């Protein structure tokens, strides 16, 4: 049986996800976290501001 081998990355991700896949599908979640966290600044398109508060002491 064959492990993963780096030098062909399109091949590596294949024969990682097919022979020792159980860390692949973890790290797919690990890349779905922050990369999708960077594809939101257009995707919220200024959706909402939460607007919470402690006590509003006002001005003169």
């Amino acid at each position: 049986a064959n492990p993963g081998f780096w030098n062909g990355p399109f091949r590596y991700l294949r024969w990682s996800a097919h022979n020792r896949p159980h860390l692949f599908f973890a790290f797919a979640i690990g890349i779905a976290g922050p990369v999708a966290a960077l594809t939101l600044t257009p995707l919220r398109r200024k959706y909402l501001y939460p607007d919470h508060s402690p006590l509003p002491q006002s001005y003169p």
């Binding site: 939460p50 607007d51 919470h52 508060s53």
Partner: protein
């Protein structure tokens, strides 16, 4: 030789092999509908949290 328990004048043969997968949806839809359910679940979950945005500032 008299009447002993001889065979039958037929066989009606029986099973000697394996058995099968159950229903027709073997493929990844059995995974993909999972992404449907979370695709529903967050669709209310965050929204309920979104509604608590209005609720907390209410109090």
């Amino acid at each position: 030789v008299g009447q002993d328990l001889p065979p039958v004048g037929g066989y009606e043969p029986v099973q000697w092999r394996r058995n099968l997968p159950a229903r027709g949806f073997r493929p990844l839809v059995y995974l993909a509908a999972l992404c449907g359910i979370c695709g529903y679940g967050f669709y209310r979950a965050l929204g309920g949290i979104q509604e608590r945005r209005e609720l907390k500032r209410e109090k």
